Amino acid sequence: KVFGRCELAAAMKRHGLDNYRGYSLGNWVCAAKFESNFNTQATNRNTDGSTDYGILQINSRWWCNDGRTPGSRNLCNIPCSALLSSDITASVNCAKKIVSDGNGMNAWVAWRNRCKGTDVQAWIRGCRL
């Protein structure tokens, strides 16, 4: 599913990401934009052999099981395919664990390089929230 910007903001807010670990909703919308272009089906294979899945590009080395990332973990206790659903519930629950892991949203390389230090409130402007 390719979300609209405000449609995703609304879904993230309902699932409790607005100010989760102190990160306002615009941070999460910006992250999704530059990770996946708001596409739940986005996948990308990494040089280490791991794959990033779904609207927040959650990685198979630590967070999900895809059966093809040797020596990896599954700390969200989910098949990586769950992160590609039109239903963002699994992606959100896993993202809450990731952002609590120690480095905050710096875990998302596109957030650190393209959202951090920018006017992230702009990503929720005009939305009915």
Side-chain angles (χ1 to χ4, degrees), residues 27-101:
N27 285 285
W28 297 101
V29 176
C30 186
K33 167 68 183 177
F34 295 125
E35 289 291 1
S36 68
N37 209 15
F38 302 144
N39 184 355
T40 70
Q41 298 195 80
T43 63
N44 294 106
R45 197 87 157 272
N46 303 130
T47 67
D48 70 357
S50 69
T51 303
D52 297 339
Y53 296 82
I55 197 125
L56 286 171
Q57 290 290 276
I58 291 170
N59 184 273
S60 65
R61 190 149 299 286
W62 280 98
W63 303 103
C64 62
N65 180 57
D66 65 9
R68 64 166 209 196
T69 311
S72 77
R73 298 295 289 285
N74 185 5
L75 294 177
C76 288
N77 250 277
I78 46 163
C80 299
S81 63
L83 296 167
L84 305 181
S85 180
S86 65
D87 172 356
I88 68 170
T89 298
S91 285
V92 173
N93 289 330
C94 192
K96 282 178 179 173
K97 184 181 297 294
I98 295 164
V99 75
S100 301
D101 189 58

